[PDB]
Write a protein that binds this ligand. Structure first.
Ligand SMILES: [Mg+2]
Ligand SMILES: [Mg+2]
Ligand SMILES: [Mg+2]
Ligand SMILES: [Mg+2]
Ligand SMILES: [Mg+2]
Ligand SMILES: [Mg+2]
Ligand SMILES: [Mg+2]
Ligand SMILES: [Mg+2]
Ligand SMILES: [Mg+2]
Ligand SMILES: [Mg+2]
Ligand SMILES: [Mg+2]
Ligand SMILES: [Mg+2]
Ligand SMILES: [Mg+2]
Ligand SMILES: [Mg+2]
Ligand SMILES: [Mg+2]
Ligand SMILES: [Mg+2]
Ligand SMILES: [Mg+2]
Ligand SMILES: [Mg+2]
Ligand SMILES: [Mg+2]
Ligand SMILES: [Mg+2]
Ligand SMILES: [Mg+2]
Ligand SMILES: [Mg+2]
Ligand SMILES: [Mg+2]
Ligand SMILES: [Mg+2]
Ligand SMILES: [Mg+2]
Ligand SMILES: [Mg+2]
Ligand SMILES: [Mg+2]
Ligand SMILES: [Mg+2]
Ligand SMILES: [Mg+2]
Ligand SMILES: [Mg+2]
Ligand SMILES: [Mg+2]
Ligand SMILES: [Mg+2]
Ligand SMILES: [Mg+2]
Ligand SMILES: [Mg+2]
Ligand SMILES: [Mg+2]
Ligand SMILES: [Mg+2]
Ligand SMILES: [Mg+2]
Ligand SMILES: [Mg+2]
Ligand SMILES: [Mg+2]
Ligand SMILES: [Mg+2]
Ligand SMILES: [Mg+2]
Lengths: 187, 124, 105, 147, 52, 52
RNA sequence: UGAAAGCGGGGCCUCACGAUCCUUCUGACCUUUUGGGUUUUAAGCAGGAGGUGUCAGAAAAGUUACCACAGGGAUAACUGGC
RNA sequence: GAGAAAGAGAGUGGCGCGGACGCUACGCCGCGACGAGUAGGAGGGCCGCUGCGGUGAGCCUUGAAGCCUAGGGCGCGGGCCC
RNA sequence: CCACGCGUCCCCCGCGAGCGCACGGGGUCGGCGGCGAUGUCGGCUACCCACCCGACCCGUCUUGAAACACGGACCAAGGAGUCUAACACGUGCGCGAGUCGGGGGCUACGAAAGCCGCCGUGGCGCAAUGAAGGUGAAGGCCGGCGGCGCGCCGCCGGCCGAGGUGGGAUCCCGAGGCCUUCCAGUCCGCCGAGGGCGCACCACCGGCCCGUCUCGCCCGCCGCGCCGGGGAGGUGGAGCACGAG
RNA sequence: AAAUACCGGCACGAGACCGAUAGUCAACAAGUACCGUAAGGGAAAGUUGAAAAGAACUUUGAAGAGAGAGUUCAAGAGGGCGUGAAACCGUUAAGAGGUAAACGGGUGGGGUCCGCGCAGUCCGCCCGGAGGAUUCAACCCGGCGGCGCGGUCCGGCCGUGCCG
């Protein structure tokens, strides 16, 4: 025979989205072409990011967009998001932004446009810049989800600040034998 | 548009027909009668179709005009060609080529016109 | 016999719960019955207000809700007496009375 | 849909997804959350620490209405009032300062988390924090109590 | 457009409603692809089939 | 798209009238058959009587 | 303690020991005791102890030849096998 | 397709009316290596059954469902068409 | 001998054509011959029979079953991971610091569907922590007014104003050149030495809030008190550190 | 009083339910037949055909049962009668037969039918030879269509654009 191990023989990654959305698949049909037929790897990253799941493309907020476009050097560039540019109400003055996301929520659209900005989609993005140059690609906060407060080294195991699955935060609900030192032992 | 309509009609249309590990599309202006984006007779701004005439001789060639897209009555134009087999095919060839009118399927129209004319000369 | 990680929980199905289960398939029949009765009453008291009597501004009790004003139970006797309305004539001319309400303000 | 679940693919397979050696018996580790001290000790130590035992005082007749005091932050303090009040206050040169009644919005207590923009305010709250008050003062502004 | 709203005025006969925004606007893919913006910035096609 | 054609009203004898109303923006809201199938699947279960 | 460097928070090292609930004692001008205040009282918070030697910790005597049920050739009373 | 970072790039002066297939892009095509399997996990079913919304200007007394068959066949197979 | 000619400065000694054959990116013949109407021609498979090689009866529990292990005479129909609730994670969809009318109300299929918005009551989220009273999530610089053997700074007006280190997909600048006769020489792209701004994320150091301990000096006044507020250094938290529900 | 609850009763309407081993125990002379001393247990069991037109009459036997004749579209629907499978059985035909039968791989032989086989494909262009049409190009008139290559023709309409 041959002594291969066939355990990891299959790459797990996505070839296509698991959505039957049709505007998303037409964006896929455009970026399959641009990634297959340009040499720029922005199109391969945008192809792989249109492929992803809702929890793999998290929404960055307008505050992250403001800060990460105010980093010096990338003036009058084009922010490129594959998730959702949501509004962030704890910012007041918004600069002129040139954004490109799949979906921008309503008051964030009003905010950017009356700041004086311009909101593109990916089709007119690819008409504006096919190799995608002059673009700052950005991502949402991906460990921002609350399900990551439960992940990692278990609770009840020292040096591990993992939130446990408790049906109610209270006084009687997991405070006693592993948490105290007067009751039992502390970790 | 056209791709937007194709992403709907590609699987849940009524002209589609799926059996015997084949697939076809029974729509009224489909050269080669098969389910494809290239040949579909409903989702384009310009489309030819090759039909046998109501009189039992010759070919009515259907063109889709440019202006009245959303107006299905004054959208298609019929031309009846009742000639020999050479000039019928030459007329369909010039009509699709020299108008630059959707030249993806000039040869499919010529095949379909020839198959109709084969079936329209008498049987053995 | 619990698995690796997950919220340990107290489901209250240890009784016989299937014998006592109230299912709501007459929810829209109940709504149609109530609005048939509401239309019948609202046309049998023919010019009078359909909502019933008038009920006072009164303020919700506790620390969570005392900034909110509701419609209460009925007008107090002190309120009726300062407004001149007799406490037995009010229920006839359409005013709701309860005798239990204080007035501390 | 039972068209899509696992029991369709498991027809023909003799054990139906539960093994031949250890079968699918009825309740092999007790009903429910049983054996907390005894034989699921490692699960309730490794995954639910603090579960067994008592801590703290017993409050008998508890009322969330008594203990009700929700919070706003300084970071979202200006959400509560419309945008034209902000731009009129910044546009104004007479020094007049808008009054934000947080209790009208429904938050009893102002906390100070974020940056507050440099406009004079009058924040009319029930309770305050030390940092919320001193950020209001440092911007210029007043902290008005209302019971 | 009174019931379901337009793209700039809201729904006059709903409470809080406006039409849902598109995810790509220029839906015609072939006019995007056969356009002088993209056809400049592409490598050459290798369609020489190289069988074994 | 973004533009709005001018749909004519047809008189009850069939021939086109002189009245001509613009196409509302509902007719250029996006076509999504998956949302239509989803809402149809979940709402054609609500007119359904029990059995036991 | 030694003059000093230093050494010492038990025994030269390797064993000599015990979770939750409960009780008891110790601690602070501490917190709660419920509409307010004082005072006892109770509840807490933190640290020892009272103990589970089946020692990660049920509170527990036999008999059945009148016997039964679920199983086991995981396991005895026969032959057969090494 | 060609061993060699990158243009069969634009600019300024010294008769015959002709050309196959294709591209359900979830499609089609090209290279390589690979194929054991109980408990188990996953994927694909144009495998199958019963009923509902769509649809085939579907089928049917010029004979539907079913049942039988030394007949013609397809698919690795589930099965299916005659 | 896989060596080709000319013209010049130096030293030591870039387009020639035509055909044709083929050990050359996988087979063709531009080669043939027979038999065919009442007895023959083709059909692997499906009907019966023969021969050779192989060939123990299934399910099951088992370390091991053809077992002298148990179940099974044969057939037709029925016959076993379902539904409700709770939780977790993954995935699709809508809205997004919000979100949901589920309960109520208003208007054949339709007990559907639509609508409410001063019906968001309410849930979950947006804030943690403590047993509890409770408290409740950047700082720095300037000017003025050992204070002494608060150079720190207490208090006042202004200014900067929301960490850093390392690695980082992406992008940004561009030493140079990508020839069609040669030189200067513009415009359009392209490749790249070197250098940048650095998303998510990870590792680390800092910082902030609640408890707790230790050490200290200040500050506030309507009630100067067993009052209240402050700081520095560790440490306990399911926290913050520009939402993710 | 009202809002509220209702697997008994009177009278209804409906169903992404079941379709005679299902759905109630019960589609029928079902709480019936039957068992038990009793309390109580409790089935099986639907369908000719359109219409009985349910086979007059002859003939053998004592009769059940046949053979003819007849009704019917059909008795290949004949009073427990639609359709009528499997296990099992009778008979006919074919084939075989001493390692129980059966089986997998490989062919061989014999049947059964199928191929409507048994002088065997056609399709373009070209040359030559016999024909026949009211006949091709080019022009004219009308209509229909397609497209700055009208740089920059006149006018509307629209903007998920701007300014007055
Ligand atoms: Mg191998
Ligand atoms: Mg393997
Ligand atoms: Mg694997
Ligand atoms: Mg398990
Ligand atoms: Mg298996
Ligand atoms: Mg399993
Ligand atoms: Mg088993
Ligand atoms: Mg197990
Ligand atoms: Mg075991
Ligand atoms: Mg279980
Ligand atoms: Mg134990
Ligand atoms: Mg020490
Ligand atoms: Mg008391
Ligand atoms: Mg008292
Ligand atoms: Mg005895
Ligand atoms: Mg026994
Ligand atoms: Mg022996
Ligand atoms: Mg395998
Ligand atoms: Mg043998
Ligand atoms: Mg067994
Ligand atoms: Mg066993
Ligand atoms: Mg054994
Ligand atoms: Mg085993
Ligand atoms: Mg044996
Ligand atoms: Mg035995
Ligand atoms: Mg056994
Ligand atoms: Mg047996
Ligand atoms: Mg069966
Ligand atoms: Mg789990
Ligand atoms: Mg998820
Ligand atoms: Mg009804
Ligand atoms: Mg029956
Ligand atoms: Mg039956
Ligand atoms: Mg029955
Ligand atoms: Mg029966
Ligand atoms: Mg019958
Ligand atoms: Mg019949
Ligand atoms: Mg019959
Ligand atoms: Mg019968
Ligand atoms: Mg027989
Ligand atoms: Mg015989």
């Amino acid at each position: 025979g041959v002594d291969i191990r066939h355990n990891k023989d299959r790459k797990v990654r996505r070839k296509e989205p698991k959505s039957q959305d049709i505007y998303l698949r037409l964006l896929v049909k455009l970026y399959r072409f641009l990634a297959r037929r340009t040499n720029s790897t922005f199109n391969q990253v945008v192809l792989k990011r249109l492929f992803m799941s809702r929890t793999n493309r998290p929404p960055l907020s307008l505050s992250r967009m403001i800060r990460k476009m105010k980093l010096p050097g990338r003036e009058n560039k084009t922010a490129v998001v594959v998730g959702t540019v949501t509004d962030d109400v704890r910012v007041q003055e918004v600069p002129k932004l040139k954004v490109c996301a799949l979906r921008v929520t309503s008051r964030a659209r009003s905010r950017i446009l009356k700041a004086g900005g311009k909101i593109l989609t990916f089709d007119q993005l690819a008409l504006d810049s096919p190799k995608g140059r002059g673009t700052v690609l950005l991502s949402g906060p991906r460990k921002g989800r609350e399900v990551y407060r439960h992940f990692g080294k278990a609770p009840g195991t020292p040096h591990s600040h993992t939130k446990p699955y408790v049906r109610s935060k209270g006084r009687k609900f997991e405070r006693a034998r592993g948490r105290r030192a007067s009751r039992g032992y502390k970790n | 548009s056209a791709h937007l309509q194709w992403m709907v009609v590609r699987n849940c249309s009524s002209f589609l027909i799926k059996r015997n590990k084949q697939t076809y599309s029974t729509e009224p202006n489909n050269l080669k009668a098969r389910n494809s984006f290239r040949y579909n007779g409903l989702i384009h701004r310009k489309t030819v179709g090759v039909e046998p005439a109501a009189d039992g001789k010759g070919v009515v060639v259907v063109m889709k005009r440019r202006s009245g897209q959303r107006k299905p009555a004054t959208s298609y134009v019929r031309t009846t060609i009742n000639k020999n087999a050479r000039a019928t095919l030459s007329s369909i060839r010039h009509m699709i080529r020299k108008n630059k009118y959707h030249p993806d399927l000039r040869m499919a129209a010529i095949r379909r016109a020839s198959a109709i004319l084969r079936s329209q000369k008498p049987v053995m | 016999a619990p698995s690796r990680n997950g919220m340990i929980l107290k489901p209250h199905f240890h009784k016989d719960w299937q014998r006592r289960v109230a299912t709501w398939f007459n929810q829209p029949a109940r709504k149609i019955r109530r609005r048939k009765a509401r239309q019948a009453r609202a046309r049998r008291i023919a010019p009078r207000p359909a909502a019933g009597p008038i009920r006072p501004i009164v303020r919700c009790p506790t620390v969570r809700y005392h900034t909110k004003v509701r419609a209460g139970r009925g007008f107090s006797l002190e309120e009726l007496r300062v407004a001149g309305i007799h406490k037995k004539v009010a229920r006839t001319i359409g005013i709701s009375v309860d005798p239990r309400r204080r007035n501390k303000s | 849909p039972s068209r899509l679940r696992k029991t369709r693919k498991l027809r023909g397979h003799v054990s139906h997804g539960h093994g031949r050696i250890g079968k699918h018996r009825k309740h092999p580790g007790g009903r429910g959350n049983a054996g907390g001290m005894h034989h699921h000790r490692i699960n309730f130590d490794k995954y639910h620490p603090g579960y067994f035992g008592k801590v703290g005082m017993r409050h008998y007749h508890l009322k969330r209405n008594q203990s009700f005091c929700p919070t706003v932050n300084l970071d979202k303090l200006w959400t509560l009032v419309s945008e034209q009040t902000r731009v009129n206050a910044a546009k104004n040169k007479t020094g007049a300062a808008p009054i934000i009644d947080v209790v009208r919005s429904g938050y009893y207590k102002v906390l100070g988390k974020g940056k507050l923009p440099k406009q004079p305010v009058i924040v009319k709250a029930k309770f305050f924090s030390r940092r919320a008050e001193e950020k209001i003062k440092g911007v210029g502004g007043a902290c008005v109590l209302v019971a | 457009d009174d019931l379901y709203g337009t793209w700039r005025k809201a729904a006059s006969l709903k409470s809080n409603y406006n039409l849902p925004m598109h995810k790509m606007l220029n839906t015609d893919l072939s006019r995007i692809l056969k356009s002088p913006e993209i056809q400049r910035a592409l490598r050459a096609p290798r369609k020489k089939i190289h069988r074994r | 798209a973004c533009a709005r054609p001018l749909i004519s009203v047809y008189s009850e004898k069939g021939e086109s009238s002189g009245k001509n109303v613009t196409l509302p923006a509902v007719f250029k809201a996006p076509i999504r058959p998956d949302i239509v199938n989803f809402v149809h699947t979940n709402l054609r279960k609500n007119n359904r009587q029990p059995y036991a």
